[PDB]
From a paper:
MbtI from Mycobacterium tuberculosis (Mtb) is a Mg2+-dependent salicylate synthase, belonging to the chorismate-utilizing enzyme (CUE) family. MbtI converts chorismate to salicylate via a two-step mechanism, with the release of pyruvate. MbtI is known to exist in two possible conformations, generally referred to as “open” and “closed”, depending on the position of two flexible loops relative to the active site, as extensively analyzed in our previous work.
Moreover, we describe a new crystal structure of MbtI in open conformation and in complex with the known inhibitor methyl-AMT, suggesting that in vitro potency is not related to the observed enzyme conformation. However, these regions could be traced entirely in the fourth protomer (chain B), mostly due to stabilizing packing interactions involving the Gly277-Ile280 β-turn. We also described a novel, higher-resolution complex of MbtI with the known inhibitor methyl-AMT, in which the enzyme, conversely, adopted an open conformation.
Numbering used by the authors: 16 to 273, 285 to 327, 331 to 450
Amino acid sequence: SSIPMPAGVNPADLAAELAAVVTESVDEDYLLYECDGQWVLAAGVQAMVELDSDELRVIRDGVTRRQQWSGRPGAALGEAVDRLLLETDQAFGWVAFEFGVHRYGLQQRLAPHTPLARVFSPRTRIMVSEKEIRLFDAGIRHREAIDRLLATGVREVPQSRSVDVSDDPSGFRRRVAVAVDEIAAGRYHKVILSRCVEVPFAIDFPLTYRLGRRHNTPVRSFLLQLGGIRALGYSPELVTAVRADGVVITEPLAGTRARDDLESNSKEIVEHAISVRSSLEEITDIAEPGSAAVIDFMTVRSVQHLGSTIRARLDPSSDRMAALEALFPAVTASGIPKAAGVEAIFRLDECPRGLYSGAVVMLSADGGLDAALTLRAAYQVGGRTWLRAGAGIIEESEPEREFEETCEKLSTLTPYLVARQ
Ligand SMILES: C/C=C(\Oc1cccc(C(=O)O)c1O)C(=O)O
């Protein structure tokens, strides 16, 4: 069913307000995913797939089926998610940074019960765009919430509450210096290290999402309440998109400014070129021979970046999870060469990273996959609320400038935190 979107109603506001009110009223988890002008609210859990380092669980109708798994995490997750998609048209969820370590032989360094992915089939889907609201399997209470919201309008967003991000309790400056020393010793070229920032008060996730969305222009965005986790984020990069017709895309970004300097700066050009070569090598491993190409190489995309589009056709011997695995973790938030960068993050960052630098995903029964890189995000789990931001460290990096860069990335969220109502 479809309802015309009334004039003067912003889709991000309506979708986040609908997520807040209806799911609390009917007692269900949800994931809201913004993708190319559609805010897709996946509400309620028909079935849940939980992939951990040491176990895979599928939970349906209150019953959990547990199993041991070995080999590639993408194969284990893909087999279970393909079964979900025999019964529903789409599945949604998140994939941890730790999902990408098996490829590099680092699986044995994960602690027991480390989460790798959470993917669910929803009971209801509501898609909100500037044009209309589309309803899929929406029952009486979900339809009544949409009607009430169109009559009452969205809530006014309250004033935000400040947070101090100047302290360094995790020793980010010291950790950057260790990475700089390893890079000078030739261990690797670049690594992204990060720091958590505790938010000392509880936040309202849907209101914070709406407020931050007015001041960010992301490639994708999300807001979720799933299995005891709340999270929201303004993803700056597409990890991968797989279409039903088999076309695979990845759009790495490297080099940033607040245009002539960025396009002529040797440091930005080298970092971009190296990322593009890495993505092309990874995509070529899952692609039909001769189908991989760089389209719009090193073009300029409040920040401006150098960007490239890598496109290929998925090989009939491969699949969307093998494509996600091949491109995971993203270079943008891991390092170069990837294997040494990922290994360095185990030693020099607070692990497990969990959602941070992993992905939020939307899968479709026709073979589609849309995976956004999780950065510029906030999380709440077990009574703890936190932000997390990092910076790419190269041989010339200085700990003080890198700490300042994390402050700049945190500023996408720190002025927009709405305290719990
Ligand atoms: C998408 C590319 C960029 O931004 C990020 C890279 C690494 C870490 C972060 C972060 O926010 O932690 C980030 O926003 C970049 O800074 O090149």
